[PDB]
């Protein structure tokens, strides 16, 4: 079976945005794990998971294999390789967390759905930086509803 190493696990403030409504959820438990298998073949995956301590139905995840990361790096225009990606993402999440109490946060973590409702469609986890001139999106990840593993 795959063994997991937790690289990040904490409550994060999340702005959930649907077509006609936006809600701030403060009890979102976000984790980043490195999962590995050694036999018969050595393989590493990065798993990103969002759960909600106060809502058992809210679940999103993304599994990124070390071989699938080169596509994501290109799609997102990233400068980091697979092994450097967790620390880049964690540093952004720490900046989001440090701005949790601000009325106008400099860094925001948001989950955006193009639908009017949260459903079985993917939603986009964005890290946005705010400033007087314009908003910058540092990262967008397409998360799937549900958990990475059954139940």
Author numbering: -1 to 149
Provide passages from the article that reported this PDB entry.
Centriole assembly requires oligomerization of the essential protein spindle assembly abnormal 6 (SAS-6), which forms a structural scaffold templating the organization of further organelle components. Crystallographic, EM, atomic force microscopy, and biophysical studies of SAS-6 variants from multiple species have shown that SAS-6 oligomerization is driven by two dimerization interfaces mediated by the protein “head” domain and a homodimeric coiled-coil domain.
Similar to earlier assays of CeSAS-6N, we employed dimerization-impaired variants of these domains (C. reinhardtii SAS-6N (CrSAS-6N) F145E and HsSAS-6N F131E) to ensure that the hydrophobic cavity of the dimerization interface is solvent-exposed. To elucidate the location of A11 and A12 binding to HsSAS-6N, we assigned the NMR spectra of this domain and determined the crystallographic structure of HsSAS-6N F131E at 1.46 Å resolution. Comparison of the HsSAS-6N head domain structure to that of other resolved SAS-6 variants revealed that the human protein is most similar to CrSAS-6N and the Danio rerio SAS-6 head domain, with sub-0.7 Å root mean square deviation (RMSD) of Cα atom positions. Both A11 and A12 perturb amino acids surrounding the dimerization interface, whereas addition of other compounds did not produce a similar pattern. A12 binding involved fluctuating interactions of the methylpiperidine moiety with multiple residues of the HsSAS-6N dimerization cavity (Leu-76, Val-78, Phe-83, Lys-86, Phe-87, Leu-90, His-136, and Leu-137), compared with A11 where similar but tighter interactions were formed by the compound aromatic group. We observed the formation of two stable hydrogen bonds between the A12 sulfonyl group oxygen and the HsSAS-6N Leu-77 amide and between the A12 acetamide and the Gly-75 carbonyl atoms. As seen in MD simulations of HsSAS-6N with A12, the available hydrophobic interface in this orthologue is larger than originally thought on the basis of other SAS-6 structures, and this interface could be exploited by “growing” the methylpiperidine moiety, thereby gaining human SAS-6-specific enthalpic contributions to the interaction.
